[PDB]
Amino acid sequence: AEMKNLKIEVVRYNPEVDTAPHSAFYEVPYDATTSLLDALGYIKDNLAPDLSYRWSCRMAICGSCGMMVNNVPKLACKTFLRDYTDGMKVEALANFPIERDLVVDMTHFIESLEAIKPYIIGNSRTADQGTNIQTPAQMAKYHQFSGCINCGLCYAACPQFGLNPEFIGPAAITLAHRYNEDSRDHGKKERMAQLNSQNGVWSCTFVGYCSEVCPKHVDPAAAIQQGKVESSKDFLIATLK
Amino acid sequence: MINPNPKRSDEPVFWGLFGAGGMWSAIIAPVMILLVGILLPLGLFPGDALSYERVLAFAQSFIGRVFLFLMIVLPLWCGLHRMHHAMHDLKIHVPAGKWVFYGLAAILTVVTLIGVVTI
Amino acid sequence: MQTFQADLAIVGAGGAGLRAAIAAAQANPNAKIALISKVYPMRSHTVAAEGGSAAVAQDHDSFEYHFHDTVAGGDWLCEQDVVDYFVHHCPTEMTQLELWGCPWSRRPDGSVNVRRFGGMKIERTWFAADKTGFHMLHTLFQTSLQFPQIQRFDEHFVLDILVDDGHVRGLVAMNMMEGTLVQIRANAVVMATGGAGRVYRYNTNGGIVTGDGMGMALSHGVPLRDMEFVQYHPTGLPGSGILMTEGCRGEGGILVNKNGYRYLQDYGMGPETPLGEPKNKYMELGPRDKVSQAFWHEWRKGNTISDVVYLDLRHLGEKKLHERLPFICELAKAYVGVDPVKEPIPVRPTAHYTMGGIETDQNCETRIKGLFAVGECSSVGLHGANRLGSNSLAELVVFGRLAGEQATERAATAGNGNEAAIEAQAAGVEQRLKDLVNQDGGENWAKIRDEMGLAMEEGCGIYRTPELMQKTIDKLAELQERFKRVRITDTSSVFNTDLLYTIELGHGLNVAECMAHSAMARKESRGAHQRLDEGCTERDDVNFLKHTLAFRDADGTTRLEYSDVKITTLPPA
Amino acid sequence: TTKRKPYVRPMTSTWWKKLPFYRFYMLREGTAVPAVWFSIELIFGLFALKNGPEAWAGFVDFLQNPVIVIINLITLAAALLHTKTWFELAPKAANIIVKDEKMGPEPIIKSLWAVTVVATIVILFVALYW
Ligand SMILES: *Cc1cc2c(cc1C)nc1c(=O)[nH]c(=O)nc-1n2C[C@H](O)[C@H](O)[C@H](O)COP(=O)(O)OP(=O)(O)OC[C@H]1O[C@@H](n2cnc3c(N)ncnc32)[C@H](O)[C@@H]1O
Ligand code: SF4
Ligand code: F3S
Ligand code: FES
Known part of the structure; x- marks a missing residue:
């Protein structure tokens, strides 16, 4: 068939270059099984190879995943785009110093x-x-x-x-x-x-x-x-x- | 980074009162505001239940002086606790904020203790 | 390069590594041990283990029945002197885990319950609900916090090891946050870096299980034993690969086709058992491989659902499902949209575990003096051609302890080495990293990743053919050329995962070639390794009761050798 | 020198305005204001009660205001919200096993509401039927 697309807003930051957080927007294909972690992988594969984020297990048991989604703390690999068709906004996990992109100290x-x-x-x-x-x-x-x-x-x-x-x-x-x-x-x-x-x-x-x-x-x-x-x-x- | 030998705090005292206070005003306050704040001034009571002579007849009995002190003082130590912490939450720097709030509570506690041994 | 001294380094903070660190701290209170990992230790793949861990417990079990169940389960490719030591130490390490606070699910009387896995007649798998890996990796990580000897290097990506005159001397890691390199000097090094299951398109593993520890050993002339045996988990979610524990069948769960037929009786694991009582070695608790193979045959007859089968557990009940398969419930509910109480769960086989790994003797030492390997990265010779479900996790702590103890002695009699040689090695890792950073070509690493996954999946699958294998040898050697044209477009230093993933891929290509070449050479059918072609469709104990060793020379040619199987009491037949 | 730039996001005194759960949390600590105002009120009526029926009659005149009847209605709102929320959060301070299972909070929230209903009935009955 033909997959839908979702404008995902992700909050980027490179300490060798920005003076502070610098926003972005990526068109990501998706269906009813696509997670945020699926989206981050796609963006890094075809849209912005310099995008960093922690992850591993893919099934909500490891705990590296953590980051804000419309200002709610949630695990990306358990967050699905099907619920963010009217807007999405991934920000690095709140209350932590931001080290780079979606990774915090x-x-x-x-x-x-x-x-x-x-x-x-x-x-x-x-x-x-x-x-x-x-x-x-x-x-x-x-x-x-x-x-x-x-x-x-x-x-x-x-x-x-x-x-x-x-x-x-x-x-x-x-x-x-x-x-x-x-x-x-x-x-x-x-x-x-x-x-x-x-x-x-x-x-x-x-x-x-x-x-x-x-x-x-x-x-x-x-x-x-x-x-x-x-x-x-x-x-x-x-x-x- | 993180201390090794921190100073054991004193919050288990206030938190103790605020606990006791929070539980009294959860069971009893609702009926107390009903009676005193609504019925009484609306006369929505039978006969002379909430008349000056009856209220003084109750306040002056032993069980009444104990209940009128608890009704007043325990919610005070619970509200003013919450305010103290509402301050930090709202990022509002109140000098000697521990003394202000909790001193008000003891002030009012003495003031009410004076009252339930009668003026 | 900044240097720090250690009495031993341990690469990998999985269950294996961490147990090694403990033991090593517990064997030498004055040691200064360096435990390193590219992810915080509680993110290790260990945390995803749901089934259980094996050790003889009930009064009617015997070390011999576990011994036997492992040897036979492995199609006699098992070093029977290693399997003997294994089952004899499993009891002490499960107990020691309980003494450290692992919340093992319990019998009403306070004793540890056990359930049944891997086709083991006597049930002997300890468990903590269906979260057992999770409870086991944390008990170990948390218990390790109390040994000052253990110094961690969280999120350090170990690039290469330093070897000289046949002895190991340290390692070069990158501080992933700082993007600086660091030199760790130590006279025993304990590889514990996991399997290579992400070299498959569809797998059960996390993103970090890319093989790095095996590939490092390839580069220093150490040989990957038995790498052609890739075990396929029979029940994984379509697409995600997400694993549904066996403990879905040890609790009575059933596997059906598109006709609701429990097809597994039609393939030698008959007769059918009643819903109520699952029986070991039969039906859905069959031989691992067979339960996978039978999916393939069903797909031939056209009996799959458009392609999956179905794992039904409804007849398990709410108490039993939520008391012993909580995780499985939610996993079904979120990735396939299925209540294991209302509906059945669509599954199919998925690449899961690497039987093969760095060759080690019975001390988990490799050919290089001082370099050890333990855990899924290694091949101490315990699982032969097919791992017994629930034996893996026990391995991690049984041999983890050994490695920890053996590395601890080895470094205490090691004696110095040539400083100029060593540092010249370090300087040699550094240069190579620079050469990779300056490499250009406009090839996209991610696209190489995706093809290497499709090739392993097509040529090194459940059933194997010389023509498809050859095509995957050919595809991979083509991929080995293309990697040299990859350009690492990100040049930052603070947590640059563009660089690191590229590094993990170049380990995958190497390790995957070893698998491919090793399968193409094994002209027989044994364990996970099944061949459809004439003269290779059955086990051949005359010509192949021998381990496959794979080496890699500096010219990038993947060479094979072979070695004998130790037999002790259980002669093949 | 490192190449890092630990960017620290700052927290504003308006952090609670964002997320609703945060707001309900301010509201729930907000019930602290009407509770002490009522304890102020009672101290008034106390010392009016002592200064004779002349002063007590002044006090009841204040309670009738009726802006003070609206405020004391808001106060009866706040005290309910507190009871509702205080009852939900109390049970978490307990750890109780009932045949191999951590229980609560529903059996504890049920009993607290049963007691206040009984306290409300016994208090309305003693100050009104006599
Ligand atoms: C994937 C899987 C495996 C599994 C299972 C379920 C799933 C989904 N269920 C099992 C079960 O029920 N019973 C059983 O016996 N085994 C089961 N398994 C297999 C088992 O869990 C694994 O085979 C085993 O746990 C592997 O653990 P190990 O200690 O060997 O190490 P790891 O947890 O895989 O972690 C690897 C460590 O190495 C570090 N690392 C990796 N690369 C590097 C580099 N380049 N530099 C430095 N450190 C590195 C990782 O960070 C981690 O510390
Ligand atoms: S949110 Fe807190 S309680 Fe929950 S798993 Fe994460 S760290 Fe633990
Ligand atoms: S949000 Fe905070 S105040 Fe306590 S209950 Fe949770 S740590
Ligand atoms: S992948 Fe393990 S927590 Fe998100």
Whole structure:
């Protein structure tokens, strides 16, 4: 047959040449299976070979994809042009420094996530002794908070993060929470120092956009909140003794 | 980049009151604005339910002084919390903003505590 | 070039690499290990694994039944001394993953459940719903954060390795953000860079699985073992190639043609089983290849739906679908528009896994002293002519650990090398990068990419013919000429993916020629490698029970050698 | 010297004006103004109640204004929105397992609305039927 075309607006930036973001427009063929990631590949194949963007897996599990689409944080490989016939506008993932085109400086993300210690601490059990015993009951305590693919859409959601780039973030808070609530760990006190910081849970105002854009339904807003409970118990504890 | 030994904050105190305050004004406020803000001045009540002698007969009882202090003070510590943070959100720099808002809350808290031990 | 010293470098932060980094940090607390990758470690292809991972667990299993299931599943091309070590260490590494917090799906009593894959009579695949790769790559990446020994070089694109007098000495990588090169000196290097499945037009893999680690080993005289065995996943979404786990059949799911016939009984995996109870080795849980081949035969008889077949799971139920196939549900819903509860899912075979990889002994060392290979990039000789589904992920951590331990010893007895020689190698990578940047010609790399995919798909497919193979050898050698006329029109330095993809393609051409030449030479039919022509339509243990080694000389001729299969207890028959 | 140019996008005090979800979030914290105004009001009526029926009659005269009846109607709007939204967000602060499954929030939002209905009925009944 004959494929339709969509005027896609993508936000370009080359730090060796521009003084700031420089917009563009590309005619992209499409049908009912074409993603934004399919479009970015096409543009780079036939329209602008110098166009850069992160990607890999193509099936919404890797998390490199992240970028704004009509000012919504979303994964390109799960965004489809069929829904943007009246306009589209890809911008590099919000609240992050832009390094080039659709790629952003994820440094603060990785340092945050590194700063809460996301790994089993204090369990002397050794592989010979067989596995730990943990029910689906103990597992349902944290299982939803474990599906995070470190994509970053919620940092672009969160207006607090935009106002306070020292805020450790929804993801990072959810992850430290995911280990607090695992019956196999014994290192909650090694994490509270970060979570009790002003840049901890207490920089979160329950705006709730984070969980709304999560492509894996982790509900970070639920983890943090539960962390303010906990942070508080710890406040209580410490203060009262 | 990111600190190693950050200062444990103090927000779990305010957040505690703002929590308590937010939950009181969610269950009780709706009926309180109905009664006091609408029925009372519209006389939409049977007989002398909301008449000066009855309201003073209630306010002066023990259960009334406790409820009138909670009705006033807990939503204060919840609203003024939210304002404090609305400020940051709106990028509005208020000097000693922690003192202004929370000091207003304690000011009014004392002022209402004075009131429920009666003038 | 800026230099940094390391006790060992590990290229690739997949499951394999990362386990290697851990072990290597855990074997030498004072080591300074350099783990490098062109993508942040949690973007590695590992994250897309949905089935499970294999290790003997139940009381009625035996290392011998896994041993056997792997040897036989591999058409006896397996180094039986390697497969022995493998199944004997799978239990300890799945357990060690659980000790690190991997959320393995559980039996009600707190024990780890197991389900059935790859045509293994006794079920022994551990899993975390159908997200198992995802839970396994993160458990490892997250657990690695605690070893200061591990220094990462996130989004460094490793260009080449430095070799001299038969020993490896470091590597040259580009800092992808800065566009600068960097020298990493270290006396063991552990390749862990994945398979080469993107050399196919339609594949199951992410955009980064372009083969770079194999192609580097080609350039230093290391030989890709067994590269003609490309396993095809039987159930991939049409067009996208997106993978639908087997765990759609280990849960009872069925494969039907355009007549609703469960055609797979008609091809030696009869009789048909009842909707209710799937039985291992039969029907939709058949031999991998057969389940793919049978698609081809159905397409001959005209029994495909216009061309797909159908994977029906409706008779699975909401609880079971959403508790053990959540991912599969949403994937169907978004890329083909199908509820696995209302409708059936259109699928067909898709290039998936590269059996072949860098040749390694039983220590994952290659012929070059100090250079090791582990993971999908390697061929430690575990899968022979056909990988047992759910054996791959176990490989990553069983041998990942080994590599990590073995690289750690090797670098601790290595002894120095010729500095002027080494730096002259480094200077040699740099020059070559410049020659590529200044190369011109007005050839479009992307168009070469697309043809190389169409050729591998046409000549190195499910069934193979000397005429089409020859045509793909011929197409690829034509493509090798055209690459030299590619012009890299982008000259920037900050995250220049125009340059990098061009580099990944030149690895693909090399690795793909190895596959093509290796298949054209193997005049038999074994495992994934099936030949329609006369005298090559069956296994030939007289003349070909031997590994295919492929080398590449500096004149760009792709030469083959052959080596013997270690047999221990299970003689072919 | 590197060849980078980490372009930082700036955030305006009007960030919430863009996306609707953001706006509903300002609105939901906006209910903070009518809630303290009502607590100011009650303090008035308190100290009017103490200064005798002369002052209390002044107070009821103010409540009738009726611009103050519109404001106190807006206040009854705001307090509902708060209740609606506060009830949705409370359950997330809990992590509860019921036979191997994280539950909520629907069973928690259901109970909170049941209590306020009962509190509203018992309060309307005590201040009016006597
Ligand atoms: C694709 C796939 C594979 C797969 C599967 C499902 C899909 C869609 N399901 C499986 C299953 O159910 N059971 C199983 O046993 N295996 C399954 N597989 C196969 C398996 O996942 C893979 O074969 C295996 O996971 C490979 O992992 P590995 O550790 O070997 O490495 P990788 O994850 O593929 O990542 C490669 C790393 O190398 C780095 N890299 C690549 N090129 C470079 C260069 N040039 N320079 C530096 N680093 C490089 C990557 O960045 C990454 O770190
Ligand atoms: S919670 Fe969701 S949005 Fe946030 S990082 Fe994790 S997967 Fe991404
Ligand atoms: S958007 Fe922000 S304020 Fe908290 S709930 Fe989410 S991190
Ligand atoms: S491709 Fe993996 S997240 Fe978009």
